[PDB]
Amino acid sequence: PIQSIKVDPMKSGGLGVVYRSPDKGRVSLYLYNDGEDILLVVDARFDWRGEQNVLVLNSKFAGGEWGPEVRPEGFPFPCCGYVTTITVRVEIGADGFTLSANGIEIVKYPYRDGLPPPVTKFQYVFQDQGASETAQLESLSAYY
Amino acid sequence: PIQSIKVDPMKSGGLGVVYRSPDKGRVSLYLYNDGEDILLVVDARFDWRGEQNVLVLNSKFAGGEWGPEVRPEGFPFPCCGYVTTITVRVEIGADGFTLSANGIEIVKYPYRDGLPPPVTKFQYVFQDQGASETAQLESLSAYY
Amino acid sequence: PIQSIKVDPMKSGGLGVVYRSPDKGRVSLYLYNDGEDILLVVDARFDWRGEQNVLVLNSKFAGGEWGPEVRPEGFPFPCCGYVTTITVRVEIGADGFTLSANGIEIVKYPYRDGLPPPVTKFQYVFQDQGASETAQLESLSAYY
Amino acid sequence: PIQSIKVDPMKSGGLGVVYRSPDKGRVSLYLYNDGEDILLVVDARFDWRGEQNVLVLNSKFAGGEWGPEVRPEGFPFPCCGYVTTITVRVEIGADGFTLSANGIEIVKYPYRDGLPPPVTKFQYVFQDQGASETAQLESLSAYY
Numbered sequence A, B, C, D: 001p002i003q004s005i006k007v008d009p010m011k012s013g014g015l016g017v018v019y020r021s022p023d024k025g026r027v028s029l030y031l032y033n034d035g036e037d038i039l040l041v042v043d044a045r046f047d048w049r050g051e052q053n054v055l056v057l058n059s060k061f062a063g064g065e066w067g068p069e070v071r072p073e074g075f076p077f078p079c080c081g082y083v084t085t086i087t088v089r090v091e092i093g094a095d096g097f098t099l100s101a102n103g104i105e106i107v108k109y110p111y112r113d114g115l116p117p118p119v120t121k122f123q124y125v126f127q128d129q130g131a132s133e134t135a136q137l138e139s140l141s142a143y144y
Helices: none
Strands: A002-010 A014-020 A026-031 A038-048 A051-060 A084-093 A095-102 A104-110 A119-125 A135-142 B002-012 B013-018 B025-032 B038-048 B051-060 B085-092 B096-101 B104-110 B121-125 B137-142 C003-009 C014-020 C027-033 C038-048 C051-060 C085-092 C096-101 C102-109 C117-126 C138-141 D001-009 D016-021 D025-032 D038-047 D052-060 D085-092 D096-101 D105-108 D119-127 D136-143
Touching: A002 A135, A002 D052, A014 A119, A026 A084, A038 A084, A095 A135, A135 B051, B002 B137, B013 B025, B013 B121, B025 B085, B025 C085, B038 C096, B051 B104, B096 C102, B104 C051, B121 B137, B137 C003, C003 C138, C014 C027, C014 C117, C038 C085, C051 C102, C085 D085, C102 D085, D001 D136, D016 D025, D038 D085, D052 D105, D119 D136
Parallel strands: none
Antiparallel strands: A002 A119, A002 D001, A014 A084, A014 A135, A026 A038, A026 A119, A038 A051, A084 A095, A095 A104, A135 D136, B002 B121, B002 C003, B013 B085, B013 B137, B025 B038, B025 B121, B038 B051, B085 B096, B096 B104, B137 C138, C003 C117, C014 C085, C014 C138, C027 C038, C027 C117, C038 C051, C085 C096, C096 C102, D001 D119, D016 D085, D016 D136, D025 D038, D025 D119, D038 D052, D085 D096, D096 D105
């Protein structure tokens, strides 16, 4: 339900996950530095806490407040309680991350204050919410 | 909006397509014999004539009449008016076709009476209906 | 050992093939137009009539003779009579063809004159010369 | 020229890398446990210490010594000092390691005594030897 790859500090390239989505719950992908700061989470909510089919990006110093939430449109949530294979890319640009889902670009997210790369750890987290079709991690990938 | 590939009478293997879904309209795929009987239409309705997000499968003799509709669930329609890249795979067994979309099998469909293989033609067709983002075809593939 | 995909006249995009190579014999690819002109042959000669691991491109009007042969370095022939899976890609540019194998560019081949696009037939041919491990076709693709 | 991904204790699935091959030198792939044993090394020697196109598999206790060298045939070494893109796959199976390159399985390797999984680190080490075309890493991936 939780799996991660720990990389040599990364200032370039990108990161990919592929997983089978759930009908209920949420899938989180965290980018961490060494000091355990959250440089970025892409938080994909299918059914999480009274929210359905919403995507959230944010950031956070270790033990400190989340910034302003970014709520982009375009994320391939499936209709009607359906599950599919999701493929995501987070490319580490000079000025921000770029988030792609299934080969279509979703958003450019400029680095938050004092939260630039390097990235050292890229984590996958599925949190259930009485889901009948649970999520399945398929692959994790570092790009060079 | 209409494009197709023609094969050596194919009794085995499978067939694939990759396309950017529209937000309104419908995307259909047609597998023909040489006399142009429709051995199978995998028909994807994004917004068609009152129906939203429904998949219809059927067959038909060249200018005869459509058989029963099968409407299976699990096809990767996106929520909220969103578009994604979709991938379809129709596999050619001994006894029927198999449908995979985005890595996941959707239905096994036995051949209808007097409509067995081979396939000689495989055809992508997109039919608009005031789409704000129209479908874009990306590839067509035959597998051996 | 021979397979093809016919398309509606194609003036852009690319065509793609995957095969498992042989240790003897040649595997060759043909881009025909409606008039049955060879707009391009891409001829991988593993061991064939006294030539080992040589790639030859050419064109040749339906009937007429061949023109200048072309033999570029780069083609991923395996050592020591081993075989492997191989992926080739031919793109239809504005003034020429770009040929790629295994995501690496092999040659820009400028269109021979009076012999430009459209392309309506792409075709794999395996011709054997006593191979122990024999070629095998895996896919043929049209790109839009 | 040296990049790793560290993982949880991994006991099934696989691990793939993708590189553009060098013309001279070697590309080694190490699978370490947490006690820094080499559970398996996969050593593509393109031109290294007077040996041309040789694959050595082996294992080794941390600061102990090597084992008997396995040397399988069939590694997709390019002829003639040409470089190409190699994909490799190492599966962590029940009774052993299954090696694969370009979708074609190359050999099995039973876990050596006192040298079984979990894996915790997968490492890519390019070590040059006056190469013309230098190896370039493309991706590292974990498989679940």
